[PDB]
Amino acid sequence: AINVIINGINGKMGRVVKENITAQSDLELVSGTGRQDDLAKTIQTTHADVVIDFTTPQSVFHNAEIIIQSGARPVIGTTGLTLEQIALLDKQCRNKKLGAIVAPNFSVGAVLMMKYAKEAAHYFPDVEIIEMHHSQKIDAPSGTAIKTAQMIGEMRSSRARGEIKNGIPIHSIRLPGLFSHQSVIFGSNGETLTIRHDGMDRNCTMPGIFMACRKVMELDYLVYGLENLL
Numbered sequence: 001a002i003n004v005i006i007n008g009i010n011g012k013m014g015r016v017v018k019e020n021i022t023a024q025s026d027l028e029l030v031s032g033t034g035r036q037d038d039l040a041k042t043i044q045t046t047h048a049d050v051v052i053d054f055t056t057p058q059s060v061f062h063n064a065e066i067i068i069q070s071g072a073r074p075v076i077g078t079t080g081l082t083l084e085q086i087a088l089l090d091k092q093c094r095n096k097k098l099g100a101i102v103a104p105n106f107s108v109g110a111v112l113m114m115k116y117a118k119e120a121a122h123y124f125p126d127v128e129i130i131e132m133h134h135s136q137k138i139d140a141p142s143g144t145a146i147k148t149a150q151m152i153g154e155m156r157s158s159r160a161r162g163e164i165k166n167g168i169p170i171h172s173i174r175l176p177g178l179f180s181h182q183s184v185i186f187g188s189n190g191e192t193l194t195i196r197h198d199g200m201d202r203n204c205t206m207p208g209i210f211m212a213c214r215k216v217m218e219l220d221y222l223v224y225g226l227e228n229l230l
């Protein structure tokens with residue numbers, strides 16, 4: 001029985017986590033907190049074991065510190081942490097023998113897509129990325145596409161033609177009706193191999209989130225990246 005707080009309970013992601021957690025029998029939602037709630041107080045009142053954070057880049061680091069300093073384990077999906085902040089959080093976690101998970105992408109499908117794309121790039125040097133999002137996704141290319149290109153470029157090194165990121169063209173489609181999609185297309189003599197993730201809605205992150213809630217109990221340090229729980 002894991003006592004969970006959802007921080008950011010009123011946000012788009014916090015609302016979806018609230019809906020889905022009820023069906024997780026080994027987890028109990030003991031509170032949902034928002035901007036003007038006292039997070040440390042709630043952790044103490046509820047004896048929280050885990051705090052899921054889907055808040056804002058301006059608050060995420062201080063939220064993480066409050067969660068650890070209060071004795072609970074952060075499972076952080078919020079974007080915004082710097083390298084130096086993650087390294088400091090890790091030392092704080094290990095000092096207290098408390099676990100933490102920071103995942104820039106909580107979709108298992110997206111993280112496996114990136115894993116297999118990086119592997120395949122050892123065999124197929126020619127590759128492009130197509131990513132497609134609803135129009136509310138303002139940034140292009142997407143952070144996931146940029147990270148994918150970074151991973152592929154690392155493996156290799158070891159105007160219609162898109163935006164090159166670490167050597168890899170990325171094409172960004174923005175259309176109503178889509179949610180979050182990416183296809184990595186490798187080409188060779190006579191064939192292609194495509195690794196394609198289709199995120200239909202925000203439930204796409206829930207198996208990754210709930211997995212983190214469970215694994216963070218068995219950890220005494222910080223894990224960065226959902227792929228390191230797999």
Ligand SMILES: NC(=O)c1ccc[n+]([C@@H]2O[C@H](COP(=O)([O-])OP(=O)(O)OC[C@H]3O[C@@H](n4cnc5c(N)ncnc54)[C@H](OP(=O)(O)O)[C@@H]3O)[C@@H](O)[C@H]2O)c1
Nearest residue numbers: 008010011012013034035054055059077078079104105106
């Ligand atoms: N890691 C992943 O797979 C992934 C997936 C989706 C989203 N995200 C990231 O997670 C974050 C949340 O995204 P979203 O779409 O849910 O955003 P959102 O709809 O804007 O929700 C953010 C929520 O956090 C609340 N909040 C703001 N400051 C807070 C604070 N100091 N303490 C507690 N709550 C606070 C807001 O409250 P108010 O309503 O009062 O403003 C709002 O309810 C973003 O950084 C987003 O990029 C990550």
Ligand SMILES: O=C(O)c1ccccn1
Nearest residue numbers: 104105143144145147225
């Ligand atoms: O692993 C990362 O750093 C990452 C993953 C997906 C999106 C942005 N960043």
Ligand SMILES: O=C(O)c1ccccn1
Nearest residue numbers: 137180199201202204205
């Ligand atoms: O709001 C988004 O853009 C989103 C949310 C969850 C998963 C992928 N993308």
